[PDB]
């Protein structure tokens, strides 16, 4: 059922893909505001021991809700909090209580407001909360690597996390393509190897097909230390992820 699961994920990621360039239609919020919101969500997920998939799902819900709806400056953090609550309810075994999210928002929004925005986000998404993320495709690709290197997987998670901060240009790539680019970049960074032929057959993504997203991800990785938002770099500094954020990015991708 593994290949069937991957095929279903590929079919469903197009349905769950947010509209590209929705920030232009946003009257108030911009790409930088979304980056700050995603960074704050990374901090929240680290504080509450939330899984990486929870944060990926929260980012996906935020992107879809902003594609289908417009919110002001003050409601962007409420939207992010409601999306994080929904993702925790969907993915986590014990989602944090609504009071915890109200607390972590610095008491900006009351519990009633958080619950109302949760209802609104659920209605807008039409309860389509099982959105494929970069994490799922990355794990699926991990089952297709030999030998399994924990550094490769940790760096691929780090790069997929980095791809969440910048809507430009990672909103124009499907999660499968971003995951493939992250996997190849991690393999080249820590092992000096390329995108595997087994994954070429499984995904249909040749190394040429990932080249645009690969260049974008290499540019993000090189400029990661100088990026305005650094919570992902701090999170992956921990020995749990083998300190992959400490590794220097390769200067050039031999393609």
């Amino acid at each position: 059922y593994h290949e069937d699961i991957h095929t279903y994920l590929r079919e469903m990621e197009v349905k769950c893909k947010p509209k590209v360039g929705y920030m232009k239609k946003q009257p108030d919020i911009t790409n930088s505001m979304r980056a700050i919101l995603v960074d704050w969500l990374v901090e929240v997920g680290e504080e509450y021991k939330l899984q990486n998939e929870t944060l990926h799902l929260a980012v996906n819900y935020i992107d879809r809700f902003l594609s289908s709806m417009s919110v002001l400056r003050g409601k962007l953090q409420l939207v992010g909090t409601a999306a994080m609550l929904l993702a925790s309810k969907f993915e986590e075994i014990y989602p944090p209580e609504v009071a915890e999210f109200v607390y972590i928002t610095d008491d900006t929004y009351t519990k009633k407001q958080v619950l109302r925005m949760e209802h609104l986000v659920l209605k807008v998404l039409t309860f389509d909360l099982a959105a494929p993320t970069v994490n799922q495709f990355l794990t699926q690709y991990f089952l297709h690597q030999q030998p399994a290197n924990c550094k490769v997987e940790s760096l691929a998670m780090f790069l997929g996390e980095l791809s969440l901060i910048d809507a430009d240009p990672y909103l124009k790539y499907l999660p499968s393509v971003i995951a493939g680019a992250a996997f190849h970049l991690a393999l080249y960074t820590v092992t000096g190897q390329s995108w595997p032929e087994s994954l070429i057959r499984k995904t249909g993504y040749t190394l040429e097909s990932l080249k645009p997203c690969l260049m974008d991800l290499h540019q993000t990785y090189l400029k990661a230390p100088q990026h305005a938002q650094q919570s992902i770099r701090e999170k992956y500094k921990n020995s749990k992820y083998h300190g992959v954020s400490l590794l220097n990015p390769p200067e050039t991708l031999n393609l």
Binding site: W40, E47, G80, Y103, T105, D106
Partner: peptide, 8 residues
């Protein structure tokens, strides 16, 4: 810390 009001 994580507790912070964004976009003040």
């Amino acid at each position: 810390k994580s507790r912070v009001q964004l976009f003040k």
